[PDB]
PDB file of C-alpha atoms and ligand atoms in Angstrom:
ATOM      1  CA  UNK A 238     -16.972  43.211 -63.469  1.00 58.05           C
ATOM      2  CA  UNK A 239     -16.546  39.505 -63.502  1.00 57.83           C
ATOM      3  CA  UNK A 240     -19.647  37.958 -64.780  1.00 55.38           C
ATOM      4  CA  UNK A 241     -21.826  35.202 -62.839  1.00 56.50           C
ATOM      5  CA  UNK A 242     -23.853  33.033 -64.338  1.00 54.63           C
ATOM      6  CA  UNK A 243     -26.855  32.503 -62.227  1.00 54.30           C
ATOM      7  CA  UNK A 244     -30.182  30.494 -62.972  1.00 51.67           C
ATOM      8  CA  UNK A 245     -33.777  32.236 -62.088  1.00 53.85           C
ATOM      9  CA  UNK A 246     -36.716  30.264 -61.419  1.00 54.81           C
ATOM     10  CA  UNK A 247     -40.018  31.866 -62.703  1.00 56.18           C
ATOM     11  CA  UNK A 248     -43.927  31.377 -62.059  1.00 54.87           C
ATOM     12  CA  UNK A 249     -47.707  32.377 -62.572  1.00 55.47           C
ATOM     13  CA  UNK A 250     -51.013  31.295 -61.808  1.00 57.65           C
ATOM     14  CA  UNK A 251     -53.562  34.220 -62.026  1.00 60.38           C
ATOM     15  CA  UNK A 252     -53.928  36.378 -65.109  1.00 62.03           C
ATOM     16  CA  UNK A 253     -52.186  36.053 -68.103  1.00 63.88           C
ATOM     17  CA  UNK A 254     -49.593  33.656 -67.095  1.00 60.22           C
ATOM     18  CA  UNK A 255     -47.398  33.932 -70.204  1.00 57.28           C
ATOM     19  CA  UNK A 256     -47.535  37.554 -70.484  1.00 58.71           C
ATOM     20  CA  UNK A 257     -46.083  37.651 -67.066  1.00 57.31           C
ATOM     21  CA  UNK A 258     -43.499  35.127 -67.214  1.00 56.59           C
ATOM     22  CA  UNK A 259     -42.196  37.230 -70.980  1.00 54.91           C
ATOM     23  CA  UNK A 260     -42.856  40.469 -69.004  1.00 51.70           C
ATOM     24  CA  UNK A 261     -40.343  39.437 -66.016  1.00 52.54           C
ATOM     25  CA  UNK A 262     -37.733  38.405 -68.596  1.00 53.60           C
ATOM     26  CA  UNK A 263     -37.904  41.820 -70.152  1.00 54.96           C
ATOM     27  CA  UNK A 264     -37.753  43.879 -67.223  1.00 51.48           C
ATOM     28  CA  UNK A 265     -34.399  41.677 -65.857  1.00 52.31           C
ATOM     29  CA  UNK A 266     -32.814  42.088 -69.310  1.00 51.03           C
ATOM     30  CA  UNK A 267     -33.110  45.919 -69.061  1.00 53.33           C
ATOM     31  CA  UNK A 268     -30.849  45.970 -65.765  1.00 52.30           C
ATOM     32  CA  UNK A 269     -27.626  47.462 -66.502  1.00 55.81           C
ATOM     33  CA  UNK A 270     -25.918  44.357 -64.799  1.00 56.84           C
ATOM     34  CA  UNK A 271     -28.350  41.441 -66.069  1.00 57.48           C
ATOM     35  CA  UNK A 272     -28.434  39.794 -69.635  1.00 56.88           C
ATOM     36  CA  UNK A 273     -30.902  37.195 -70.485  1.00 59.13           C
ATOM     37  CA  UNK A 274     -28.931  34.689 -72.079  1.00 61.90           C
ATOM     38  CA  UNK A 275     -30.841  31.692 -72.395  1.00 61.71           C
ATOM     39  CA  UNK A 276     -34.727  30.362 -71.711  1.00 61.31           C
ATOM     40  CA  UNK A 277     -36.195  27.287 -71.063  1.00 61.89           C
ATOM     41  CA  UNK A 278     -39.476  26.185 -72.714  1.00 62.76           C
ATOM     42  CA  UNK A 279     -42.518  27.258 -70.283  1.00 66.32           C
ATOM     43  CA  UNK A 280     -43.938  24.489 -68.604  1.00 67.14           C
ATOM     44  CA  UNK A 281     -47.768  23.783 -67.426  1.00 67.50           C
ATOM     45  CA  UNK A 282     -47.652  22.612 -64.031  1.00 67.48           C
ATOM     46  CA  UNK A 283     -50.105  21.498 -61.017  1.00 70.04           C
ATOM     47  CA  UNK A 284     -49.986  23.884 -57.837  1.00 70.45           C
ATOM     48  CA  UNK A 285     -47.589  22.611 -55.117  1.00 74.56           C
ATOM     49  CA  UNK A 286     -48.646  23.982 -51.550  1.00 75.68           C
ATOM     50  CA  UNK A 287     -52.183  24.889 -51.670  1.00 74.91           C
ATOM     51  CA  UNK A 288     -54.823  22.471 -54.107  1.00 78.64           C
ATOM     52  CA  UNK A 289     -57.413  24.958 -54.430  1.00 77.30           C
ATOM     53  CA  UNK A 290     -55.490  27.376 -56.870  1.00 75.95           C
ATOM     54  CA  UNK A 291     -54.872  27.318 -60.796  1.00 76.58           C
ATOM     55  CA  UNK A 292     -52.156  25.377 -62.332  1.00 74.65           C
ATOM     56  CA  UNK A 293     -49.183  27.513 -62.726  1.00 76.56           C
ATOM     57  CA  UNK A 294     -46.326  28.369 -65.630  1.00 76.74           C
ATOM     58  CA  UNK A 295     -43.567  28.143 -64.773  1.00 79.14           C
ATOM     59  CA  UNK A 296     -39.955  28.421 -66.431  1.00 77.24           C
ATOM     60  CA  UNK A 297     -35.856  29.253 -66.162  1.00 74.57           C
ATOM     61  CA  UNK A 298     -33.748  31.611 -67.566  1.00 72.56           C
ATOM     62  CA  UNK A 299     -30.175  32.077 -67.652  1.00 72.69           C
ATOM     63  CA  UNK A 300     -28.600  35.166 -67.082  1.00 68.54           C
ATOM     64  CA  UNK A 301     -25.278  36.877 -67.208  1.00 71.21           C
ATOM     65  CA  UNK A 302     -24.571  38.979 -63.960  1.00 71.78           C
ATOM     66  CA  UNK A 303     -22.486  41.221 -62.785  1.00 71.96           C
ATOM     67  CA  UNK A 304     -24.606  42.389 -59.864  1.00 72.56           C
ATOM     68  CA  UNK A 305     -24.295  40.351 -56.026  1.00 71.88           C
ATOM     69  CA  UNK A 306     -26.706  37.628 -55.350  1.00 71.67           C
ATOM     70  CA  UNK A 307     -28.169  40.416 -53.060  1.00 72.90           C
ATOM     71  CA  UNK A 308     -28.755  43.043 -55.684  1.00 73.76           C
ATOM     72  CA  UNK A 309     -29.905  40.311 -57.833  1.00 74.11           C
ATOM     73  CA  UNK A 310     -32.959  39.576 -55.806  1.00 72.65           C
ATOM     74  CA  UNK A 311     -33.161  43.245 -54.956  1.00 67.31           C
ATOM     75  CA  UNK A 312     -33.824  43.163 -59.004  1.00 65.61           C
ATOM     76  CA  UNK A 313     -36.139  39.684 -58.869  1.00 65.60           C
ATOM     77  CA  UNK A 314     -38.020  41.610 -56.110  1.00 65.81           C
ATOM     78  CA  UNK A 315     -38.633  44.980 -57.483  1.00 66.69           C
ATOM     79  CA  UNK A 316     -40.143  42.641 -61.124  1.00 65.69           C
ATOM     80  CA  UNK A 317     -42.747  40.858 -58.656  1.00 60.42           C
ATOM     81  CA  UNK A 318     -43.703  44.288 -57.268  1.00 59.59           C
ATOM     82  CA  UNK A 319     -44.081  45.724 -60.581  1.00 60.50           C
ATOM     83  CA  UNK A 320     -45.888  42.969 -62.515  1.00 61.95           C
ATOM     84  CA  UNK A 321     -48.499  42.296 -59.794  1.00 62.42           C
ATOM     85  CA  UNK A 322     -49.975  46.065 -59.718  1.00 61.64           C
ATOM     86  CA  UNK A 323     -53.303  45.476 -60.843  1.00 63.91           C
ATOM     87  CA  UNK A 324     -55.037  46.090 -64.224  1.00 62.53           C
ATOM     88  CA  UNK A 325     -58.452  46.444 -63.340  1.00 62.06           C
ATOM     89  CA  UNK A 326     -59.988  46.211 -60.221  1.00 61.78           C
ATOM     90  CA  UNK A 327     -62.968  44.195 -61.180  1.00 62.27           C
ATOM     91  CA  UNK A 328     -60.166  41.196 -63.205  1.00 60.44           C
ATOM     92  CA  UNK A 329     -57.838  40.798 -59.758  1.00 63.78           C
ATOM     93  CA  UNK A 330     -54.335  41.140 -58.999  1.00 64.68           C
ATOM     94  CA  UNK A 331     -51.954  39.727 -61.389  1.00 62.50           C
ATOM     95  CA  UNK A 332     -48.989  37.411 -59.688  1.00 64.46           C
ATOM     96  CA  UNK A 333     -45.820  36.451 -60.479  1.00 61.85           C
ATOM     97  CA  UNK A 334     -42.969  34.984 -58.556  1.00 58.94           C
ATOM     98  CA  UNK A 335     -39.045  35.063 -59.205  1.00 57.55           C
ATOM     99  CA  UNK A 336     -36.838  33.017 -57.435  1.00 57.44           C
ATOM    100  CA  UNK A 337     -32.567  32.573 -57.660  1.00 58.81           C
ATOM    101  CA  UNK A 338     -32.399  28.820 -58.301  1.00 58.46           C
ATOM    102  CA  UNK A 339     -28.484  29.255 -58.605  1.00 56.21           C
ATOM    103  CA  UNK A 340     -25.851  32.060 -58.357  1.00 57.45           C
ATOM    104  CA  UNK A 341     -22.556  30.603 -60.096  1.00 57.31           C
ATOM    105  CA  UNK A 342     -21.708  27.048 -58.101  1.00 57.42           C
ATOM    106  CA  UNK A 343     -22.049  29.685 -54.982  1.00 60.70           C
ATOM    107  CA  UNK A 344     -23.734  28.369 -51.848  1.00 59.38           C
ATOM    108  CA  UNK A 345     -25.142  31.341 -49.779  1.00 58.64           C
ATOM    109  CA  UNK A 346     -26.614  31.370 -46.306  1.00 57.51           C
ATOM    110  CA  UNK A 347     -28.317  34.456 -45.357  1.00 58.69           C
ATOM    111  CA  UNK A 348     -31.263  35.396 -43.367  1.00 59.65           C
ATOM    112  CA  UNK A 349     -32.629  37.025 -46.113  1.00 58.48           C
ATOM    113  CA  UNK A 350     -31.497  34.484 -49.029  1.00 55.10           C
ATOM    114  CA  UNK A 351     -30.561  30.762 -49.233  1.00 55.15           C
ATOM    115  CA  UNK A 352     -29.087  29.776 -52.605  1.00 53.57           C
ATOM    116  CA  UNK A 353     -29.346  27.246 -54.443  1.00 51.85           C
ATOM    117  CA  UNK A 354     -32.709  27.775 -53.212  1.00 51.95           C
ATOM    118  CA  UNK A 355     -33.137  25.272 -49.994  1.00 52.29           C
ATOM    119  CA  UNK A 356     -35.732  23.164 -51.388  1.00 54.06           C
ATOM    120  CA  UNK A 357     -35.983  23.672 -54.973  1.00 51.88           C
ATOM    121  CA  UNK A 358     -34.483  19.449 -55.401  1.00 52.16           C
ATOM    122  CA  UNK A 359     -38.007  18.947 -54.102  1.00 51.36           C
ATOM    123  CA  UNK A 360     -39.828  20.789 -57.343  1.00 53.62           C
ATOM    124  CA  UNK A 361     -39.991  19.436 -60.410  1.00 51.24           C
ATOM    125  CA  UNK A 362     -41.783  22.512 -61.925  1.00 46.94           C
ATOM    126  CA  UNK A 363     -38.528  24.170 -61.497  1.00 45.36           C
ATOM    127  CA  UNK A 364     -36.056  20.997 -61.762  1.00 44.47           C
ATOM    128  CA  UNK A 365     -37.797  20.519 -64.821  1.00 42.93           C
ATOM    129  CA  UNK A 366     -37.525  23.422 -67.145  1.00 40.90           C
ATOM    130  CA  UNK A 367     -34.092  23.949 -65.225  1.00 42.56           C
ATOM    131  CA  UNK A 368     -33.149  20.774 -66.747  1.00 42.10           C
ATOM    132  CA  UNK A 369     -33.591  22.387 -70.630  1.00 36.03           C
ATOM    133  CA  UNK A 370     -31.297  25.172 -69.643  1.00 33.36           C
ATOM    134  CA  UNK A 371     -28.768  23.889 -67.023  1.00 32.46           C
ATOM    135  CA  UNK A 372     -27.898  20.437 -67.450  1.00 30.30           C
ATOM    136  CA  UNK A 373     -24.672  19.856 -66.813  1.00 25.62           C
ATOM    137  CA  UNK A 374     -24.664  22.733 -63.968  1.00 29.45           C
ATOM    138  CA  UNK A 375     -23.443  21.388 -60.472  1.00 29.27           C
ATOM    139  CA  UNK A 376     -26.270  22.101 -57.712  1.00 29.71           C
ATOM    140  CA  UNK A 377     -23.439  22.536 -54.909  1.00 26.90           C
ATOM    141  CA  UNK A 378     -25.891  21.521 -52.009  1.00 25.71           C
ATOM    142  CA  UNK A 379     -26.441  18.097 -53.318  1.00 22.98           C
ATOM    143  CA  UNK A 380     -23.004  17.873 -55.485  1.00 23.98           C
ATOM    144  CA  UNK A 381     -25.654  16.484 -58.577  1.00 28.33           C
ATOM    145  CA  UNK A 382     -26.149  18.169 -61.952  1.00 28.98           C
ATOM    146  CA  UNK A 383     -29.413  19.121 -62.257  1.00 29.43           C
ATOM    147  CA  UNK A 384     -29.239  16.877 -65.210  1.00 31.95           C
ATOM    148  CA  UNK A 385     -29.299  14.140 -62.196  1.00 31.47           C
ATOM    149  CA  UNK A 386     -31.180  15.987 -59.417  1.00 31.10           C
ATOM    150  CA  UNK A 387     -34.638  16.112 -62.194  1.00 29.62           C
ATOM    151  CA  UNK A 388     -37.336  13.220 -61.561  1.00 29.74           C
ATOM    152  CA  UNK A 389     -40.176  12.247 -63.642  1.00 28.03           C
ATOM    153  CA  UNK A 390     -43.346  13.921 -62.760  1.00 26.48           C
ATOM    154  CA  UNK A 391     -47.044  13.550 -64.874  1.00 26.61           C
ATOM    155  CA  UNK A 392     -48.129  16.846 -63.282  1.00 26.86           C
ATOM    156  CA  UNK A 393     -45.276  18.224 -65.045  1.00 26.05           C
ATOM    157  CA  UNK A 394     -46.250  19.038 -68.920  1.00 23.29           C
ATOM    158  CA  UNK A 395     -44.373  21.210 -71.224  1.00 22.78           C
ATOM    159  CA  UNK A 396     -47.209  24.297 -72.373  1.00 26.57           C
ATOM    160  CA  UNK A 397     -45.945  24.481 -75.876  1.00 28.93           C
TER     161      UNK A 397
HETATM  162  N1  B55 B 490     -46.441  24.321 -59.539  1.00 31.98           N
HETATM  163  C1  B55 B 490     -46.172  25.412 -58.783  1.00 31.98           C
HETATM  164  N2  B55 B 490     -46.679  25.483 -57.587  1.00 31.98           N
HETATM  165  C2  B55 B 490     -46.288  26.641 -56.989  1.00 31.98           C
HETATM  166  N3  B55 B 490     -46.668  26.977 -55.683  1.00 31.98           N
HETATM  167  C3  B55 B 490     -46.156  28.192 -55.451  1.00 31.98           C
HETATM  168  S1  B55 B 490     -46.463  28.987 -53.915  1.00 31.98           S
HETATM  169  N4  B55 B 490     -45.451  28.661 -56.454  1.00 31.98           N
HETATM  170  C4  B55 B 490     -45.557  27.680 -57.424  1.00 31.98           C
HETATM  171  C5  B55 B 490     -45.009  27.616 -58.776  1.00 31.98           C
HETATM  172  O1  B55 B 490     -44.346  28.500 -59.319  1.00 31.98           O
HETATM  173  N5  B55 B 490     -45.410  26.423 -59.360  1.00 31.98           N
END
């Protein structure tokens, strides 16, 4: 029962973004082994990968664990399937992604998992709300605090 604090990256583009990015939260508090403990403030943030899409939210949240990183994303996974059922036909499929930013100042290297998340020093939609919530937090690939890893970027901007 020894609690890990871990560091979840959230996201949506399609729908209503900030109902699905207060919906995830929700559903991870209710697991037995997660409690939401802290949120960052939701930021508005240009797509990264494809162009042609909508802007994204995207946030962080801090949670209390007492689950493995692998039953943690066995959790983040079974939120995405849930809050991207559709509504209505006609409106589209809803989306939402979870990620595990960090897992305690863990490094894990799985086929099925790499955190920190392998790339995630590239992002400032998630090294930016991270930042709000995890300052002072090692990022054991790099050996930086977030607080240092987080760059300025203007297609960055917090929602409200
Ligand atoms: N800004 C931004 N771009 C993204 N591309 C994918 S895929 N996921 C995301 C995301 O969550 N935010």
């Amino acid at each position: 029962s020894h609690m890990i604090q871990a560091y979840l990256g959230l996201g949506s583009n399609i729908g209503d973004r900030e109902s699905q990015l207060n919906d995830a939260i929700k559903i991870l508090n209710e697991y037995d082994g997660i409690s939401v403990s802290n949120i960052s403030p939701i930021y508005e943030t240009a797509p990264v990968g494809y162009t042609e899409q909508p802007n994204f939210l995207n946030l962080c949240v801090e949670i209390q664990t007492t689950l493995t990183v692998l039953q943690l994303l066995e959790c983040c996974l079974k939120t995405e399937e849930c809050l991207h059922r559709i509504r209505k036909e006609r409106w589209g499929p809803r989306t939402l992604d979870v990620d595990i930013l960090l897992y305690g100042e863990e490094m894990i290297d799985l086929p099925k998992l790499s955190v920190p998340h392998p790339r995630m020093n590239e992002r400032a939609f998630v090294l930016i709300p991270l930042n709000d919530i995890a300052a002072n937090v090692v990022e054991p690939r790099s050996k930086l605090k977030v607080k240092d890893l987080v760059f300025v970027d203007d297609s960055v901007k917090r929602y409200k």
